[PDB]
Design a protein around this ligand. Structure first.
Ligand SMILES: O=c1ccn([C@@H]2O[C@H](COP(=O)(O)OP(=O)(O)O)[C@@H](O)[C@H]2O)c(=O)[nH]1
Ligand SMILES: O=c1ccn([C@@H]2O[C@H](COP(=O)(O)OP(=O)(O)O)[C@@H](O)[C@H]2O)c(=O)[nH]1
Ligand SMILES: [Cl-]
Ligand SMILES: [Cl-]
Ligand SMILES: [Cl-]
Ligand SMILES: [Mn+2]
Ligand SMILES: [Mn+2]
Ligand code: NA
Length: 525
């Protein structure tokens, strides 16, 4: 046998779903699919339903998948592209695309697949037929990419799937987001909707409108058993069935108002206990402390940053410099924030407030991942997972950052790796911009904030701390505009003084630390 042409004929034979046009968002995830992704995108641009946007989230592809999607996204306003800077799984990438999407209806399409040119039209009409309907799905077929023949799944040409789901945007803010596993969470989220809304509000359009490419070592190969060249058996694996039993029980036992909070996004800890095979989340085995200073001139920026990072950490330390009162959204955090209000500009140490909590944590011998942020930077949804995972790459023995400065060894002769600019490979540097750094507290045995004498140059004093402790500063790899600026219309005598007094710099300062450790060996070229 059977072919894709036979499916196309059956669809034209049917009128199901052919009788105000809201924006439809299609969320595409991609991971090393450069051979397939342009076919996936073109099958959406050729959709009958014309009021669409295609949201593409690349999950840190090592091939040129994102280069292709970036090329296409600049040809049209219907395509927008984003890149996670670490491999976190398709469901983390879907949730990132949802937050970027703008449509009232949300569909999905994996990058290794294509679909029928009438899929969104027919499914949208079925969805909106009955105003009490919450979501719609259609059927899919597995295909051999060479021959365009149907691979039968349990001896059927087509069957209902989960990638074919379409739903109103309100689902995600009422019951939360996809669980950030590697596989299975579409089965979970489907049955999460059915619990909350009632399965009768899930309409099924039983037509073969989605065409799944069959490729080896993909995510669903976990469940495959080959019979012949035209049939396979789909049967859950052990690790998949542990998860199915798990969320079924969870669906019964979890108060339905809590789904919204159990499955928030972004996140850094597993929502459900799963083996490491099922999760790519950082899962820090120590607490995560986010430290930020802010001024009232940038309250619109600070509101954004607290919303994104609120679930990306265990605790905040907020230093308000000149606020009239604590904004609503900061004290809403409650105990998650240790706020420090400073109303007199004369009693202010300014950006040195990023390191107030560092003294207390060392004095109490409490460990954690210490992150410092500014209030003019837009942090992506994968920020804290990426930083902890890069820190773990060097076994927590180093400090990582994004705004890196490298000096001559004997401005204008500094090389500046700006945080919003790209960097292809990790590169050791001399100074990291403290709006973007991260490190483990147990690198440091002693610390006193009194050492940070003058304000306005916290970046420099922190390098001197790292140098005097034999600690290396790593500028990690990143796509362009992973972080971005939101200055929005918002010498150096002491600067040059502190540098020369504490020489040497350049690669002479870095090479002693790269010297005999093989994980650092490629940081210095
Ligand atoms: O770490 C990963 C693994 C997979 N995928 C994407 O998830 C989608 C579905 O994965 P796969 O094709 O492996 O699923 P299957 O075809 O086995 O059902 C594809 O677009 C992959 O690029 C992803 O974004 N990140
Ligand atoms: O009086 C001030 C001015 C600035 N900052 C903080 O200093 C950091 C960086 O400020 P800015 O973006 O001006 O620094 P630059 O990027 O120019 O180094 C942010 O946390 C600001 O809220 C502060 O606490 N008090
Ligand atoms: Cl990006
Ligand atoms: Cl899956
Ligand atoms: Cl948390
Ligand atoms: Mn696939
Ligand atoms: Mn700044
Ligand atoms: Na675009």
């Amino acid at each position: 046998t059977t072919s894709i042409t036979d499916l196309y004929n059956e669809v034209a034979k049917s009128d199901l779903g052919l009788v105000a046009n809201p924006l439809v968002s299609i969320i595409m995830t991609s991971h090393n699919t450069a051979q397939f992704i342009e076919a996936s995108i073109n099958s959406l641009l050729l959709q009958t339903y014309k009021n669409i946007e295609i949201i593409i989230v690349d999950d840190d592809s090592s091939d040129n998948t994102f280069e292709i999607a970036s090329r296409i996204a600049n040809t049209t306003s219907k395509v927008r592209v984003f890149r996670l800077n670490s491999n976190l799984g398709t469901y983390f990438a879907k949730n990132t695309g949802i937050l970027k999407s703008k449509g009232d209806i949300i569909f999905f399409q994996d990058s290794d697949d294509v679909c029928h040119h009438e899929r969104i039209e027919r499914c949208v009409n079925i969805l909106l037929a009955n105003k009490e309907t919450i979501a719609v799905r259609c059927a899919y077929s597995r295909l051999a990419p060479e021959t365009q023949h149907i691979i039968k799944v349990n001896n059927m040409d087509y069957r209902l799937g989960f990638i074919t789901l379409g739903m109103h945007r309100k689902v995600f803010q009422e019951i939360g987001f996809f669980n950030c596993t590697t596989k299975g969470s579409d089965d979970e989220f489907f049955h999460r909707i059915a619990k909350y809304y009632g399965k009768e509000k899930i309409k099924n359009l039983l037509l073969p409108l989605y065409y799944n490419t069959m490729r080896e070592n993909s995510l669903f190969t976990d469940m495959v058993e080959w019979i012949d060249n035209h049939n396979i058996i789909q049967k859950m694996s052990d690790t998949r069935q542990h998860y199915a039993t798990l969320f079924q029980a969870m669906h019964n036992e979890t108060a339905s108002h809590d789904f919204k909070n159990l499955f928030q996004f972004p996140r850094i800890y597993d929502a459900l206990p799963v083996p490491q095979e099922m999760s790519k989340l950082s899962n820090p085995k120590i607490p995560v402390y986010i430290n930020i200073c802010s001024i009232p001139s940038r309250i619109a920026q600070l509101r954004r940053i607290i919303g994104i990072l609120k679930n990306q950490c265990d605790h905040f330390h907020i230093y308000l410099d000149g606020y009239v009162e604590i904004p609503d959204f900061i004290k809403n955090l409650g105990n998650k924030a240790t706020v420090v209000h400073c109303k007199d500009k004369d009693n202010s140490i300014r950006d040195n407030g990023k390191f107030i909590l560092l003294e207390e944590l060392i004095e109490k011998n409490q460990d954690g991942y210490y992150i410092t942020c500014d209030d003019d930077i837009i942090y992506p949804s994968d920020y804290i997972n990426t930083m902890i995972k890069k820190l773990n790459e060097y076994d927590d023995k180093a400090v990582i950052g994004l705004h890196g400065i490298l000096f001559p060894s004997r401005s204008a002769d500094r090389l500046v790796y700006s945080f919003y600019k790209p960097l292809e490979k990790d590169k050791a540097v001399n100074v990291l911009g403290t709006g973007t750094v991260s490190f483990r507290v147990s690198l440091f045995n002693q610390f006193s904030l009194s050492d940070f004498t003058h304000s306005g140059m916290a970046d420099i004093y922190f390098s001197l701390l790292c140098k005097k402790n034999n600690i290396l500063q790593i500028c990690i790899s990143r796509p362009a505009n992973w972080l971005t600026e939101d200055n929005r219309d918002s010498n150096d005598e002491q600067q040059t003084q502190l540098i020369m007094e504490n020489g040497p710099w350049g690669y002479s300062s870095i090479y002693p630390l790269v010297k005999n450790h093989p994980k650092f060996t490629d940081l210095i070229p």
